[PDB]
Ligand binder design. Structure first.
Ligand SMILES: *[C@@](C)(CO)[C@](*)(O)[C@H](Cc1ccccc1)NC(=O)[C@H](Cc1ccc(OC)cc1)NC(=O)[C@H](C)NC(=O)CN1CCOCC1
Lengths: 233, 239, 220, 244, 248, 243, 238, 231
């Protein structure tokens, strides 16, 4: 038995590396950066037909121009998402402008290693967040996709997959993705890869899709417009 | 001052303290609630009340606000704290926003409170799952549940506690528009689900109904025994 | 008030009047102003009446706690230090004009302590509204190393001077005689003032008051 | 002296034979570091340190193991350099607070005592670890003359005519006893400090090294200064020529 | 530092609090303490553990504590930990009276203390209070009441209950004789002597070995009365005639 | 019982199955780690302190090596044990003594200083966060009322007045020497009291000292000020011993 | 084995394992090369791709107008230290209206990084830095470690397979001080090149350059800005 | 650099026992014997004061300490621990007097002191006191005798003995003590109870005894102890 801020002989932190393993348990999520916009996809993994599928939100909006998709321990991300939402509004209040996708990713990444036992505040974290995040939005640099993990490392990705079957999904993305593909091609590609790795058959109420683009704001797909691309197998 | 990490990650990426708290709710009394189209009803089984015990003081169904009520499973002492924190929040939402609390909001508060107790120093997770029930100032009925981890979902019908697996799969079969037609039939679905675990209830069944018109109505062992007979002549109608 | 203290051949003689005032009215005709600090140290008090009572009690409490730990007789300087530093901390908001007197293993000691926390070590001291009148007696009649009964007479005459010449003071004279051998707390040492005998008969005869409501509750 | 469960895991824990091993292991850390030497002469104190060159990519005067604590006080460290640097800050601050409170330069005996008390505080608790370094303090004035104190990880301070701390500290002390020091001027002490370092330094064990010198005394008007390039080189010639 | 922490407020692999269950074992070693609800009142009966010839007997009681004008409690477990809780109970009762200007309702006093006991099981890192309490009282809402409290912070209202040594054997004995809505104070007292006779390992049962307190509504005010030796001896001799009634 | 262990009763300051505190017991053994012995003898006129002054190499400034410490003008002491711990307890002693005068307006009794340090040392006996100090303090001084005083406080928190005592490696053998000499009562003048202290340290170590091998501290009735004896004065007593 | 849990636990050999393990995190991240001339200080950093469908990690960060850093280890610890360095520089300019001397900033890092290595329940900073700065004393290259020890170096390289760069920097060391800016960067890249397997070397995707000096403030070159520096390349003579 | 542990060191064993308290009880059992007797006229407290070396000054440190003018104390177990409780009891006694201007009743003081002893069995990073207390006092025209042990529990006694041979002490007491013995006779039987467990022959510098009646609490002078030793 040890403390939470203990280094392994290799050089990495135990609790942080174990938190990465918690993502492997969570449902798979895909994001694709495109000239025309950014799409975010996630599987819900409904365990019972009695459970309302719309109450499982794994893609949420941070601002009009920024969306976020999580995987792992959903309950942990709720504070991270709220801190992100507060930061974009605080930025607007002070600077009268929208915050950049990279800045919001960076703000959240600062909270990642804010855990500890001794020398800690009355309301301090005890463990890292067991959640990976996919930030997708549009700013001055255009449509951008950012990935985050418990280690606090954040990096821009052309396309990224995180979750249980993230290994097979990423190689599927490397096979399909190239620089010039459209957003319509991006949504189509993300869903095909999603239906391959899912244990359950991909359905309209089974998944979530959201796109942020230069044209208009964050938009989550309804049952009808989900079915519009579900019928393309 | 006591800053010791209680809940930590395991080598395989698990949170044992959370999972152990989920074992504590498993040992608790069976709690089930179904959502109709006019009334929402929840009920608790696995009672085994000693008879010599005052049954009014051991009620597991509690009202939170004029429009929100909840049931639980697991550590009864833990729940009382959560219920009191949820009740304070219901009045605090009225002091800041004036508007009454929505069923989703109060669930989100309970969930965030339970989540905060899995990621804080010197604290141990809550060993309860809650079934939150209410009506929006919109007309639409609502049914939610929480668990020690802090994850919450909406349900058409759900069961947590002792033998939750058994009642969960009974509801999956028995939940149709025919079963939730009128007020009486939605109540029947709860009781029929409780008879899957409990050794012939009536005395061993606590259940309460909520309509969008009136507050909470807890049914007494006289009104519950009426449904024991009404479903009995349905069961003994095979010939 | 009038309070006074003197150092004689054998020890200390403390004096005080017994009048307490509320505005310009006599609140207590018989008040105790000479306070217990320790078996060997006593302290006269003037100023805010409540401040006098509570300050003198707290220090009496602290000294008893001190003497129990040391196992020896407390010193007047210890009482002085405890009073001085406390009153200073409160910047004179605790209105306690004090005369501190006692006998140590060091000998006889007398102090005057002001509400702001300044102390004077002197053979004779006066505090209170009638202190100047009392001082006029001390400056006129005091001699070094007086006999016990001579000093008793001097202090009682000083307090009397305050009593009769100051409106803030009146009634009885209290003395406290402390020596290496003996402690004498003479509460009513002198009764110079007395109420005139009633001449008229104002007996309110039974049933002279009209009653509207009556309830009698029995007891154990 | 090597018992199992606990006893040596904490600084708040005595061993059965009444020892605090965490303090002794912090002393083991200073014994593994290179040697630091200081001599008190008739008119000042001279320091010498064998700075080990870990890589040829480092500059001259890098990783100064010689410090200015106050305008009249010098510091020579051995052991874990990170802990030594933080102990220099404490030393500086205590020397700073004295001037602000009283007006004059802090006496070395008083400065040593205050810093040694701070070192000692880190030997009593499980919440902190002992410093893994020993250090020397040298000063000179017209009133007090030359003074030299040394403080080890335990928090003990003593006055020294000559002192050595580090890898070959016992081997160096046998070479210091050859010197008269009491009737020697500090001009000729720098000369001697240089060679003792070259003698004690193990050429086949430790490959490359650089010599650091500092002094405080009559010659430097009471200020602790670095030994000039001219004077250092003359002493290093005496070190290499007496190698025959 | 974390090596010396025994982790008092932690879940077990099976999902239970070890320090609470281990504390419950401590209650089972303490003296037998029971309570019975009647129609005309409510009583507590406790086994005296301070039973030495050389003891002084200065207080009115050993195990029974008066908390309120209308309320009283009894204790089973670590006696010092009980002194902390009983003192806190009196404060809570006074806080309520200061604010609302009426006596605290029985259930409200029990929950307030249980909130404290629950706290010591979830955070702080301290050991739980090794005490189980039985509460008796009257309020304007539910009348005569009887409540039980755990070290876990769990509480319950009972018509008849027992805690302490031979708790299980006593509760099944109460489960036999008790009549709901039919028990009078005389019949509840007779039951109390019977249950204690069987659970007492020294089955002679003198008045100096037991302790009985009654709570009655008397002409508008609540009366809490601890029965003295001559009253208790008389109750035992009544029960002793029932052992002589079996000879039929 | 006796020799039994359960839990961390040997690592922190908690009870063993016997009701012992091993961590406190180890601190007494930590006193012997200094490798030195102190002797304190009380006379009818004075109080005497004597300690081993070990200077192995001439590179050490002998003037800085001391275990005699000035706490007050009237109170001095000798420290036996771990040197870093000893100085810590001295600075605390000085602080307690100064604050006593400030609050109460008179000089702290030797009696009361020893009690105060013992009370502080008691905290380390009860709190698990820190180990007790591996040292022992013997205070001398002349009280205004009861004359010469000798007091000694432990790492355990025990304190007591003495006619004579010792501390350190040769503690148990020295106390046997003092017992024989107190049994045969003399006139305890400054001359014999100092000599007794030196002879006790001399016989128990079988060394026969040079004036640089020991350090002496005295407090006299006519001269209540605490004094550290110079080598000249020590040698004067040592040549007076040669009989 | 039992002495490797806490920074407060001393090993019987006189070592602290927790500090040594934190130092391993530096050797985990990709190599970065720091070198100076007489007027300029240059940081050349190799970037890691987690999967070449994603961008190469940010390795060079701004501190002030005259100071810049290249990190090796944990990113979140790197940004934490970076914010501390920024703050101290900002305070210096707020109070004194002049840039904070590089050596003084590094001394402050030494202070801040020492604290956790002596407190229980705390951990060392899992990042080593190479600091490039210019002040009154000319260009500077400083090295920091998880242990609060720091170095004032002529040139330095830390990271994965940074051993090969150390050899190159040592041999072409005497050429550095008299060298011009154009070739001073070339020497940096030719050092960073050695820290790569013989298949492929430096490109526009994986090279980041940070230059500060008497001429210009600290500027980061990354993609299109890095391609003039790569031109005039000399193939690997392995 | 310091803070403090916030977790209890006294915990419940699987068998349901607070092990540290029972081990602290072992410490008092191994302590020097002390006895207390209520005389219904006064209270007597007597303790063994074996000095072991003659070099020890007997009058320097006392085992029988006064809390205030009417309350007195003895212990069995650890000297240092007892002394902390002494200071705490004295301070508690003064708190009461400052509020009520009335000498604190023995029962109230004992309750307040026991609360402190309770704290050290539950508070963070501390062990219980290895001391049992004998508290005597005169108030309300009535004598009182109380015992406070490591757990924080108090008991009111007519007569009791603690420390070494507490079993032999009590069995001697109930055999010899009767609730009618006057203070003079109470002192005799207090010394006799110690004599039952002494082994070493008594002197007036070998035992400490304090009495408490309407005149207040005081320690008996060595001369008085010597005259009583003429048994
Ligand atoms: C003589 C009588 C002054 O005229 C003495 O100083 C006497 C001191 C004394 C008396 C009894 C017991 C102990 C000591 N002082 C008083 O009798 C005093 C007069 C006074 C009134 C107001 C003051 O302003 C702060 C100061 C002195 N009388 C009182 O304390 C009376 C009983 N209380 C009040 O008048 C109410 N005060 C309290 C202080 O704050 C303002 C309202």
């Amino acid at each position: 038995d040890r403390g939470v801020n203990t280094f392994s002989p290799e050089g990495r932190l135990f609790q942080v590396e174990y938190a990465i393993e918690a993502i492997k348990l969570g449902s798979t999520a895909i994001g694709i950066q495109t000239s025309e916009g950014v799409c975010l996809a996630v599987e819900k993994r409904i365990t019972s037909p009695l459970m309302e599928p719309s109450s499982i939100e794994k893609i949420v909006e941070i601002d009009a121009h920024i969306g976020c998709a999580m995987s792992g321990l959903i309950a942990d991300a709720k504070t991270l998402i709220d801190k992100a939402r507060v930061e974009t509004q605080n930025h607007w209040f002070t600077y009268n402008e929208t915050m950049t996708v990279e800045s919001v990713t960076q703000a959240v990444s600062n909270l990642a290693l804010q855990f500890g036992e001794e020398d800690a505040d009355p309301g301090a974290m005890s463990r890292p967040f067991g959640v990976a995040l996919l930030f997708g939005g549009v700013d001055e640099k255009g449509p951008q996709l950012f990935h985050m993990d418990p280690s606090g490392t954040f990096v821009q990705c052309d396309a990224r997959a995180i979750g249980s079957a993230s290994e097979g999904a990423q190689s599927s993305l490397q096979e399909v993705y190239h620089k010039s593909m459209t957003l319509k091609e991006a949504i189509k590609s993300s869903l095909i890869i999603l239906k391959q790795v899912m244990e359950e058959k991909l359905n309209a109420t089974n998944i979530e899709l959201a796109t942020v683009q230069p044209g208009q704001n964050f938009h989550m797909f309804t049952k009808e417009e989900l079915e519009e691309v579900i019928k393309d197998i | 001052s006591y800053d010791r990490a209680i809940t930590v990650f395991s080598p395989d990426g698990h949170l044992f303290q959370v999972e152990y708290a989920q074992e504590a709710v498993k040992k608790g009394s069976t709690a089930v609630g179904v959502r109709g189209k006019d009334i929402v009803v929840l009920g608790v089984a696995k009672k085994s009340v000693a008879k010599l015990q005052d049954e009014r003081t051991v009620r597991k169904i509690c009202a939170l606000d004029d429009n929100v009520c909840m049931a639980f499973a697991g550590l009864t002492a833990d729940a009382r704290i959560v219920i009191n924190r949820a009740r304070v929040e219901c009045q605090s939402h009225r002091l800041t926003v004036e508007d009454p609390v929505t069923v989703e909001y109060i669930t989100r508060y309970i969930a965030s409170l339970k989540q905060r107790y899995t990621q804080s120093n010197g604290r141990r997770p809550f060993g309860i799952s809650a079934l939150i029930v209410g009506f929006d100032f919109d007309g639409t009925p609502r049914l939610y549940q929480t668990d020690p981890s802090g994850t919450y979902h909406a349900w058409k019908a759900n069961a947590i506690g002792r033998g939750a697996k058994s009642v969960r799969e009974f509801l999956e079969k028995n939940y149709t528009d025919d079963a939730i037609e009128t007020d009486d039939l939605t109540i029947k679905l709860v009781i029929k689900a409780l008879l899957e675990v409990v050794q012939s209830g009536g005395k061993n069944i606590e259940l309460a109904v909520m309509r969008r018109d009136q507050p909470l109505k807890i049914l007494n062992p006289e009104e519950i025994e009426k449904y024991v007979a009404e479903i009995e002549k349905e069961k003994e109608e095979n010939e | 008030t009038t309070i006074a203290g003197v150092v004689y051949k054998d020890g200390i003689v403390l004096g005080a009047d017994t009048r307490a005032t509320e505005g310009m009215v006599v609140a207590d005709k018989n008040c105790s102003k000479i306070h217990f600090i320790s078996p060997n140290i006593y302290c006269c008090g003037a100023g805010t009446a409540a401040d006098t009572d509570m300050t003198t009690q707290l220090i009496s409490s602290n000294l008893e706690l001190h003497s129990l730990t040391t196992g020896r007789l407390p010193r007047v300087v210890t009482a002085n230090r405890m009073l001085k530093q406390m009153l200073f901390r409160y910047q004179g908001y605790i209105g306690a004009a004090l005369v501190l007197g006692g006998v140590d293993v060091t000998g006889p000691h007398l102090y005057s302590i002001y509400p702001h926390g300044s102390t004077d070590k002197l053979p004779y001291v006066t505090m209170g509204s009638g202190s100047l009148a009392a001082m006029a007696v001390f400056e006129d009649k005091f001699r070094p190393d007086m006999e016990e009964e001579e000093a008793k007479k001097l202090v009682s005459e000083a307090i009397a001077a305050g009593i009769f010449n100051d409106l803030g003071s009146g009634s009885n004279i209290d003395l406290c005689v402390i020596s290496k051998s003996k402690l004498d707390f003479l509460r009513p040492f002198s009764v110079p003032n007395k109420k005139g005998t009633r001449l008229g008969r104002y007996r309110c005869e039974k049933g002279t008051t009209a009653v509207l409501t009556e309830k009698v509750t029995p007891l154990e | 002296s090597s018992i199992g469960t606990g006893y040596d895991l904490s600084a708040s824990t005595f061993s059965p034979d009444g020892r605090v091993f965490q303090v002794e292991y912090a002393m083991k850390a200073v014994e593994n570091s290179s040697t630091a030497i200081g001599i008190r002469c008739k008119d000042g104190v001279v320091f010498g340190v064998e700075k080990l060159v870990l890589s040829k990519l480092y500059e001259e005067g890098s990783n100064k193991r010689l410090f200015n604590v106050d305008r009249h006080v010098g510091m020579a460290v051995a052991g874990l350099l990170a802990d030594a640097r933080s102990l220099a800050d404490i030393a500086r601050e205590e020397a700073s607070n004295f001037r602000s409170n009283f007006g004059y330069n802090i006496p070395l005996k008083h400065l040593a005592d205050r810093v040694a008390m701070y070192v000692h505080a880190y030997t009593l608790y499980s919440a902190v670890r002992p410093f893994g370094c020993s250090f020397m303090l040298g000063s000179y004035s017209a009133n007090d003359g030359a003074q030299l104190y040394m403080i080890d990880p335990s928090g003990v301070s003593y006055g020294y005519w000559g002192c050595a701390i580090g890898k070959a500290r016992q081997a160096a002390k046998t070479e210091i006893e050859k010197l008269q020091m009491k009737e020697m001027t500090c001009r000729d002490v720098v000369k001697e400090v240089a060679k003792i370092i070259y003698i004690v330094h193990d050429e086949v064990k430790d490959k490359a090294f650089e010599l650091e010198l500092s002094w405080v005394g009559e010659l430097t008007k009471g200020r602790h200064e670095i030994v000039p390039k001219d004077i250092r080189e003359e002493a290093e010639k005496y070190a290499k020529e007496s190698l025959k | 530092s974390r090596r010396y922490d025994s982790r008092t407020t932690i879940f077990s692999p099976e999902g239970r609090l070890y320090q609470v269950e281990y504390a419950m074992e401590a209650i089972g070693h303490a003296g037998t303490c029971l309570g019975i609800l009647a129609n005309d009142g409510v009583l507590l009966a406790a086994e005296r553990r301070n039973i030495h010839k050389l003891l002084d007997e200065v207080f009115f009681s050993e195990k029974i504590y008066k908390l309120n004008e209308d309320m009283a409690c009894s204790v089973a477990g670590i006696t010092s930990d009980a002194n902390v809780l009983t003192n806190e109970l009196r404060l809570i009762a006074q806080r309520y009276l200061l604010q609302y200007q009426e006596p605290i309702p029985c259930e409200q006093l029990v929950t307030a203390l249980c909130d404290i006991k629950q706290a010591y099981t979830q955070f702080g890192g301290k050991r739980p209070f090794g005490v189980s309490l039985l509460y008796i009282g009257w309020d304007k809402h539910y009348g005569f009441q009887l409540y039980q409290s755990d070290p876990s912070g769990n509480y319950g209202g009972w018509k008849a209950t027992c805690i302490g040594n031979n708790s299980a054997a006593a509760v099944s004995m109460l489960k036999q004789d008790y009549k709901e809505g039919e028990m009078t104070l005389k019949s509840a007292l007779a039951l109390a002597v019977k249950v204690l006779n069987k659970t007492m390992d020294v089955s002679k049962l003198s008045a100096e070995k037991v302790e009985i307190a009654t709570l009655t509504r008397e002409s508008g005010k609540t009366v809490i009365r601890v029965l003295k030796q001559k009253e208790v001896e008389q109750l035992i001799k009544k029960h002793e005639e029932e052992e002589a009634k079996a000879e039929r | 019982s006796r020799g039994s262990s359960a839990g961390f009763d040997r690592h922190i300051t908690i009870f063993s199955p016997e009701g012992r505190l091993y961590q406190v017991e180890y601190a007494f053994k930590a006193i012997n780690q200094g490798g030195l012995t102190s002797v304190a003898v009380r006379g009818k006129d004075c109080a005497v302190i004597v300690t081993q002054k070990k200077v192995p190499d001439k590179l050490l400034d002998s003037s800085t090596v001391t275990h005699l410490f000035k706490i007050t003008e009237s109170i001095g002491c000798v420290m036996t044990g771990m040197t870093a711990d000893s100085r810590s307890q001295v600075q605390r002693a000085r602080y307690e003594a100064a604050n006593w005068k400030y609050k109460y307006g008179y000089e702290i009794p030797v009696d009361m200083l020893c009690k105060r340090i013992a009370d502080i040392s008691q905290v380390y006996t009860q709190n698990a966060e820190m180990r007790p100090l591996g040292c022992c303090m013997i205070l001398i001084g002349i009280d205004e009322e009861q004359g010469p005083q000798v007091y000694k406080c432990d790492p355990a928190g025990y304190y007591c007045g003495f006619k004579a005592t010792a501390a350190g490696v040769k503690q148990t053998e020295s106390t046997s020497f003092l017992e024989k000499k107190v049994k045969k009562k003399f006139d305890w003048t400054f001359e014999q009291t100092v000599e007794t202290a030196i002879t006790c340290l001399s016989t128990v170590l079988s060394i026969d000292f040079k004036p640089s091998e020991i350090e002496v501290g005295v407090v006299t009735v006519e001269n209540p000020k605490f004094r550290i004896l110079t080598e000249a004065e020590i040698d004067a007593h040592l040549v007076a011993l040669a009989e | 084995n039992q002495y490797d849990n806490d920074v407060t636990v001393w090993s019987p050999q006189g070592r602290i394992h927790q500090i040594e393990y934190a130092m391993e995190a530096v050797k985990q991240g990709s190599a970065t090369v720091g070198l100076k001339s007489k007027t300029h200080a240059v940081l050349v950093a190799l970037k890691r791709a987690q999967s070449e469908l994603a961008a190469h990690q940010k390795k060079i960060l701004h501190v002030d107008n005259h100071i810049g850093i290249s990190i090796a280890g944990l990113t979140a610890d790197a940004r934490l230290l970076c914010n501390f360095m920024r703050q101290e520089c900002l305070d210096s300019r707020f109070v004194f209206d002049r840039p904070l001397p590089v050596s003084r900033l590094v001394s402050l890092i030494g202070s801040k990084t020492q604290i956790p290595t002596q407190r229980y329940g705390r951990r060392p900073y899992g990042v080593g830095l190479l600091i490039a700065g210019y002040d009154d004393m000319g260009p500077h290259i400083f090295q920091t470690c998880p242990s609060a020890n720091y170095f004032d170096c002529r040139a330095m390289s830390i990271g994965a397979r940074s051993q090969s760069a150390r050899t190159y920097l040592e041999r072409h060391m005497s050429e550095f001080m008299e060298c011009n800016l154009d070739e001073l960067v070339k020497h940096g890249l030719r050092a960073l090149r050695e820290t790569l397997p013989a298949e492929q070397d430096l490109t526009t995707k994986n090279v980041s350059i940070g230059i500060v000096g008497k001429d210009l403030e600290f500027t980061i070159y990354d993609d299109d800005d890095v391609s003039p520096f790569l031109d005039g390349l000399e193939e690997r003579p392995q | 650099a310091k803070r403090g542990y916030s977790f209890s060191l006294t915990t419940f064993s699987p068998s349901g026992k607070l092990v540290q308290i029972e081990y602290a009880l072992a410490a008092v059992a191994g302590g020097a014997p002390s006895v207390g007797i209520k005389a219904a006229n006064g209270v007597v407290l007597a303790t063994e004061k074996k000095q072991k070396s003659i070099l020890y000054d007997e009058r320097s440190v006392h085992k029988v300490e006064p809390i205030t003018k009417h309350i007195g104390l003895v212990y069995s177990g650890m000297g240092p621990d007892y002394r902390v409780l002494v200071h705490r009891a004295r301070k508690l006694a003064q708190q009461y007097y400052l509020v009520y201007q009335e000498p604190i009743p023995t029962a109230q003081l004992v309750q307040r002191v026991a609360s402190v002893m309770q704290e050290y069995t539950q508070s963070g990073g501390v062990r219980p006191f290895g001391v049992s207390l004998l508290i005597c006092g005169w108030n309300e025209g009535r004598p009182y005798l109380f015992q406070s042990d490591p757990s924080g529990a108090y008991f009111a006694w007519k007569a009791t003995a603690m420390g070494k041979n507490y079993v032999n002490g009590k069995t001697f007491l109930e055999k010899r003590y009767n609730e009618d013995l006057e203070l003079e006779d109470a002192i005799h039987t207090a010394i006799l109870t110690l004599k039952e467990s002494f082994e070493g022959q008594m002197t007036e510098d070998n035992i400490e005894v304090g009495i408490c009646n309407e005149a207040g609490f005081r320690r008996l002078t060595p001369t008085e102890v010597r005259d009583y030793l003429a048994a």
